[PDB]
Design a protein around this ligand. Structure first.
Ligand code: D12
Ligand code: DD9
Ligand code: OCT
Ligand code: OCT
Ligand code: HP6
Lengths: 115, 36, 64
């Protein structure tokens, strides 16, 4: 199983970027896709989770409204669209995945967000 | 005429020798494929 | 997960087995007749090779 993201994104403050997690190896509507934020200085941080087939999501209380999860079965990819981009959103956004538990054993390469 | 009838003989003499061959060459080609 | 019909056996007694070791290790053997469903691929029918599966899945408990 593998998770291919998109390249880095340089977005202006106040805009909104949409990050993609291309699942090459399994149907995207099969497992829960997770999203994590790693800003330097701090540690990692769990954004939320989405099941790309049932449209179900679970956002962290700190990221409610900030991030919005979608999916597209035609391409096997789960999107995370960050709105109201600020300089605080300068971090790396991974799309992990836990198959046999709430741990994260399948990761993406990471997508840097420069704002 | 009667010479024209000879084509009516070879029209069956060719089948009598070639038609069962066309089923034998198929029979070799059928099992080689679906045995894989 | 693909049982498609199942029933315990209850002939002269419920066909259940229980064996509790001294440290708590429980054993549990029950006799079950299943009618599991396996989707068959008949692309080469008389000479096909099937693969029928059974899935022992939990229902009301998550993986924690
Ligand atoms: C002159 C006509 C010759 C007839 C040839 C018949 C060959 C048939 C072989 C293919 C059968 C499917
Ligand atoms: C005159 C002999 C005819 C043989 C035809 C063989 C056709 C093989 C498909
Ligand atoms: C009936 C004739 C069969 C010959 C081909 C056998 C190939 C396995
Ligand atoms: C001419 C006979 C062809 C047999 C192979 C068919 C494969 C789909
Ligand atoms: C003289 C040709 C005879 C063909 C017999 C094939 C079964």
């Amino acid at each position: 199983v593998q998770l291919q993201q998109s390249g880095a994104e340089l977005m202006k403050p106040g805009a909104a970027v949409k990050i993609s997690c291309k699942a090459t190896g399994h149907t995207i509507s099969r497992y829960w896709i997770d999203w994590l934020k790693q800003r330097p200085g701090h540690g990692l941080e769990w954004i939320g989770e989405i099941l790309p087939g049932s449209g179900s999501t679970n956002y962290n209380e700190k990221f409610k409204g900030k991030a919005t999860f979608t999916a597209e079965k035609s391409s096997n990819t789960a999107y995370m669209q960050l709105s109201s981009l600020t300089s605080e959103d300068s971090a790396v956004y991974y799309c992990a995945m836990g198959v046999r538990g709430n741990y994260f054993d399948y990761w993406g390469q990471g997508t840097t967000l420069t704002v | 005429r009667k010479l024209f009838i000879q084509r009516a003989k070879k029209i069956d003499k060719i089948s009598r020798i070639g038609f069962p061959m066309a089923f034998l060459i198929f029979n070799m080609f059928y099992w080689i494929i679906y045995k894989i | 997960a693909n049982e498609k019909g199942a029933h315990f056996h209850e002939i002269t007694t419920d066909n259940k087995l229980l064996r509790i070791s001294r440290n708590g290790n429980v054993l549990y053997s029950i006799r079950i007749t299943l009618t599991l469903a396996c989707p068959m691929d008949l692309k080469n029918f008389p000479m096909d090779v099937q693969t029928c599966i059974m899935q022992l899945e939990s229902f009301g408990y998550t993986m924690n």
